[PDB]
Amino acid sequence: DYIYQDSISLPWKVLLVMLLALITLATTLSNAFVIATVYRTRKLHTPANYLIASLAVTDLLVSILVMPISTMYTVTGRWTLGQVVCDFWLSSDITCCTASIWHLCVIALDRYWAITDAVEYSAKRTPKRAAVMIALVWVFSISISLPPFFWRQAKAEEEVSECVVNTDHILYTVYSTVGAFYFPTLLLIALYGRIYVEARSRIADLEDRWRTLEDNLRVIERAANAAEVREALTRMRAAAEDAQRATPPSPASPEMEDFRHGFDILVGQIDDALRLADEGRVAEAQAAAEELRTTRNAYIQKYLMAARERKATKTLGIILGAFIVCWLPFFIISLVMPICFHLAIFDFFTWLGYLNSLINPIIYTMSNEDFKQAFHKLIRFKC
Amino acid sequence: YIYQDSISLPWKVLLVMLLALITLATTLSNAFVIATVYRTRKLHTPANYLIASLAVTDLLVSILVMPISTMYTVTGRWTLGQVVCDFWLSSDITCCTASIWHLCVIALDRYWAITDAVEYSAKRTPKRAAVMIALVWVFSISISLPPFFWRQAKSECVVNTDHILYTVYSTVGAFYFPTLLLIALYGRIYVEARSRIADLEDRWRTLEDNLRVIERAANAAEVREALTRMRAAAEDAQRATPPALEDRSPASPEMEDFRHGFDILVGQIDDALRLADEGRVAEAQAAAEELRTTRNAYIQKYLMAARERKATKTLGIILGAFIVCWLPFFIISLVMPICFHLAIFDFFTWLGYLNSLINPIIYTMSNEDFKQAFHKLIRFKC
Ligand SMILES: CSc1ccc2c(c1)[C@@H](N1CCN(C)CC1)Cc1ccccc1S2
Numbered sequence: 176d177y178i179y180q181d182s183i184s185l186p187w188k189v190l191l192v193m194l195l196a197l198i199t200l201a202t203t204l205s206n207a208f209v210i211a212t213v214y215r216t217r218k219l220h221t222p223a224n225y226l227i228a229s230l231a232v233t234d235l236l237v238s239i240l241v242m243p244i245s246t247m248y249t250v251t252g253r254w255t256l257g258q259v260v261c262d263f264w265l266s267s268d269i270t271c272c273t274a275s276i277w278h279l280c281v282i283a284l285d286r287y288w289a290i291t292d293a294v295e296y297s298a299k300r301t302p303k304r305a306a307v308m309i310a311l312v313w314v315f316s317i318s319i320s321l322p323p324f325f326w327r328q329a330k331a332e333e334e335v336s337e338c339v340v341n342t343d344h345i346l347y348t349v350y351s352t353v354g355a356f357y358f359p360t361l362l363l364i365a366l367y368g369r370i371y372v373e374a375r376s377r378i379a380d381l382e383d384r385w386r387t388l389e390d391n392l393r394v395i396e397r398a399a400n401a402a403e404v405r406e407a408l409t410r411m412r413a414a415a416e417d418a419q420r421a422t423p424p425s426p427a428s429p430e431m432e433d434f435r436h437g438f439d440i441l442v443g444q445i446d447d448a449l450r451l452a453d454e455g456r457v458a459e460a461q462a463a464a465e466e467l468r469t470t471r472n473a474y475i476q477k478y479l480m481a482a483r484e485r486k487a488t489k490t491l492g493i494i495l496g497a498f499i500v501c502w503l504p505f506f507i508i509s510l511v512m513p514i515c516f517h518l519a520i521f522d523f524f525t526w527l528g529y530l531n532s533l534i535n536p537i538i539y540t541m542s543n544e545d546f547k548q549a550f551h552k553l554i555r556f557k558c
Numbered sequence: 559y560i561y562q563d564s565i566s567l568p569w570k571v572l573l574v575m576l577l578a579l580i581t582l583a584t585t586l587s588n589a590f591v592i593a594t595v596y597r598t599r600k601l602h603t604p605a606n607y608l609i610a611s612l613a614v615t616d617l618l619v620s621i622l623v624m625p626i627s628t629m630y631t632v633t634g635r636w637t638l639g640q641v642v643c644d645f646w647l648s649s650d651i652t653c654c655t656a657s658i659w660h661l662c663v664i665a666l667d668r669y670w671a672i673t674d675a676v677e678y679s680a681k682r683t684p685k686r687a688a689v690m691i692a693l694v695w696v697f698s699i700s701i702s703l704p705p706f707f708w709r710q711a712k713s714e715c716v717v718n719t720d721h722i723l724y725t726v727y728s729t730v731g732a733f734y735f736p737t738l739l740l741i742a743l744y745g746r747i748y749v750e751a752r753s754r755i756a757d758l759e760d761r762w763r764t765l766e767d768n769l770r771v772i773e774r775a776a777n778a779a780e781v782r783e784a785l786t787r788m789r790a791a792a793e794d795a796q797r798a799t800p801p802a803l804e805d806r807s808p809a810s811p812e813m814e815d816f817r818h819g820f821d822i823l824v825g826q827i828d829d830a831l832r833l834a835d836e837g838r839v840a841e842a843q844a845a846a847e848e849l850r851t852t853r854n855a856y857i858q859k860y861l862m863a864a865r866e867r868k869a870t871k872t873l874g875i876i877l878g879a880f881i882v883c884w885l886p887f888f889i890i891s892l893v894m895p896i897c898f899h900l901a902i903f904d905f906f907t908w909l910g911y912l913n914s915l916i917n918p919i920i921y922t923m924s925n926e927d928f929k930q931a932f933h934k935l936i937r938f939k940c
Pocket residue numbers: 265268269272273274276340348351352355356502509510525528
């Protein structure tokens with residue numbers, strides 16, 4: 176029994192409490208940054224952003240209930256706080272960190288329902304629905320941490336020298352590891368590959384509907400009779416109609432209302448250029464095609480931003496990517512620990528795992544343009 | 559565009575040849591085991607009954623799954639229709655699931671055989687082994703049952719991706735959960751074995767040093783002090799039961815020989831203590847020379863514990879191979895939806911099936927009962 180913390184000198188001990196309390200703080204500020212931004216901004220009050228808020232709540236509770244106590248226990252190498260504190264430290268640590276994974280999946284589940292059931296769930300999605308999901312996330316995270324302590328009743332010790340999870344029951348060693356990490360993690364990897372292709376699909380959908388509207392504008396311009404024109408317009412009508420069915424979705428930006436109003440305008444123009452041929456004016460419908468092209472240049476160069484909506488999916492992929500690299504090495508290494516300086520690196524991937532609670536809100540700021548401007552506004556880098 | 563069409567007929571033939579070889583080798587290997595168990599009277603145990611039902615499982619892969627797979631892989635098309643695609647996946651999922659869970663039920667028996675060695679030796683019957691077999695199959699079934707329960711409501715054969723819920727639940731409950739169970743049950747028993755060898759490897763160091771002492775000892779106080787600690791070492795060696803024999807029957811003939819061997823050696827310590835009371839010391843040093851000869855014969859024979867830890871390691875090679883077989887399938891399966899690629903996905907499916915071959919061949923290579931059973935069959939020995 177040799178604690179390696181003793182070999183590490185006082186200069187580095189200080190640097191490490193400094194560094195870890197920095198991380199602890201950086202996490203306390205970043206997640207507080209998000210929760211305030213959501214609550215204060217009326218624009219952002221959505222069942223979508225509540226999940227994002229309750230995620231930062233969770234990651235904030237790591238920087239509060241877990242991370243500073245870890246800061247002590249990691250640097251020192253001994254647990255001075257006793258048994259009942261060792262209890263709630265692990266309980267909160269598993270529960271918070273569990274809830275942060277399950278808030279991610281409840282987020283991606285809402286994003287799954289926002290697309291596939293876009294028609295259905297837009298009515299179903301209330302704050303109550305977002306709230307009940309949040310409640311079950313915490314409640315599950317609790318009942319993951321609840322089993323170790325029900326069993327602890329047989330032995331009682333006056334003094335405590337160390338605080339790590341119970342390895343007595345293998346049953347709840349696996350159950351926790353999987354139920355808390357593996358299961359909802361693999362869930363998110365599945366919900367990403369799901370929605371990544373969904374985005375890839377609906378963009379090919381509308382890009383093909385654009386090639387319809389693009390080529391048929393060339394047809395109307397080049398068509399020498401009234402029949403080839405209406406033929407183009409009828410294929411443009413059914414294309415704009417089909418394109419309308421598929422919509423990108425969370426705060427729906429003013430620009431996006433403008434591309435949907437850009438379609439109702441465009442369909443308004445297809446209805447007029449048909450009335451123009453009914454009036455018998457063909458070379459006018461070829462001037463109405465010069466018109467549609469200007470509406471195209473107005474709204475569709477702006478629609479070259481549905482291409483951004485697909486990239487807004489990739490950012491959740493980067494969360495998933497970061498999330499994994501953070502926690503997985505812990506869960507890789509934790510199972511090999513009994514067989515396998517080594518205890519130093521186990522302590523490391525716990526912090527690397529806690530580092531997710533920092534990394535989750537900073538991504539939203541970098542990725543999401545709502546928060547980035549909220550961010551630029553606070554420090555005043557952008558007027 | 560299906561790439562099976564680009565692959566030429568000569569290689570098509572080599573691949574049905576290779577896969578049907580694997581299909582056969584698996585049909586042969588697992589039948590080899592099941593026959594050996596039933597036929598050998600020595601081997602009839604609830605322990606090997608589990609080992610048999612594992613080979614049963616792996617045999618059903620070489621039957622229900624592998625020859626049908628052999629076709630669908632080489633051609634690239636499923637000609638057999640809907641109701642066949644149903645039972646092919648059902649059997650494939652159920653068998654391959656049962657093979658992971660027969661492994662864990664094996665390691666669960668090995669866990670209860672060691673840690674609860676006192677308790678479970680009475681609890682372990684064939685009935686106890688059998689009910690476990692049943693729940694293994696039953697679980698494996700109810701993993702394959704949901705796709706079909708749900709399709710009732712509403713050219714190629716692959717698993718249902720409609721419910722992401724049961725895409726995951728199946729992937730985890732059938733593979734990830736019990737695999738991680740086995741990795742945990744191995745790290746459990748690997749250290750458990752390391753512990754019981756270290757206990758008695760330390761007891762060896764006690765009785766060795768105290769023999770140096772008594773050989774270098776000049777007094778009755780120093781000798782009797784040595785003898786008391788040698789007695790209590792044998793008594794404290796008796797609280798700890800040995801791992802090779804805990805997996806055996808607790809009352810085995812080999813076990814009584816090491817416990818009676820302790821009673822002999824302690825009986826020898828009782829005379830050399832009584833010898834010091836009479837005032838005879840250098841006679842106890844003729845008695846100490848006597849102790850060394852007896853101890854070496856008994857300890858070199860019990861030095862088969864170097865073997866018990868290694869008999870655990872053979873499950874470690876199974877766990878190791880098993881994972882290397884199936885994991886790449888489960889690595890790739892999650893990356894497939896996003897990410898020529900379908901060629902290698904088909905490959906780790908066969909590499910996964912290759913486990914059904916690799917499981918019984920290990921028992922032969924590892925277990926010395928089968929190795930001799932094998933040499934006898936083919937007439938390897940003159
Ligand atoms: C096999 S040991 C094990 C099993 C389950 C869980 C953990 C560790 C948990 N640790 C983290 C480190 N902390 C010092 C103790 C609790 C890791 C985690 C992370 C995120 C969500 C849920 C969980 S549950």
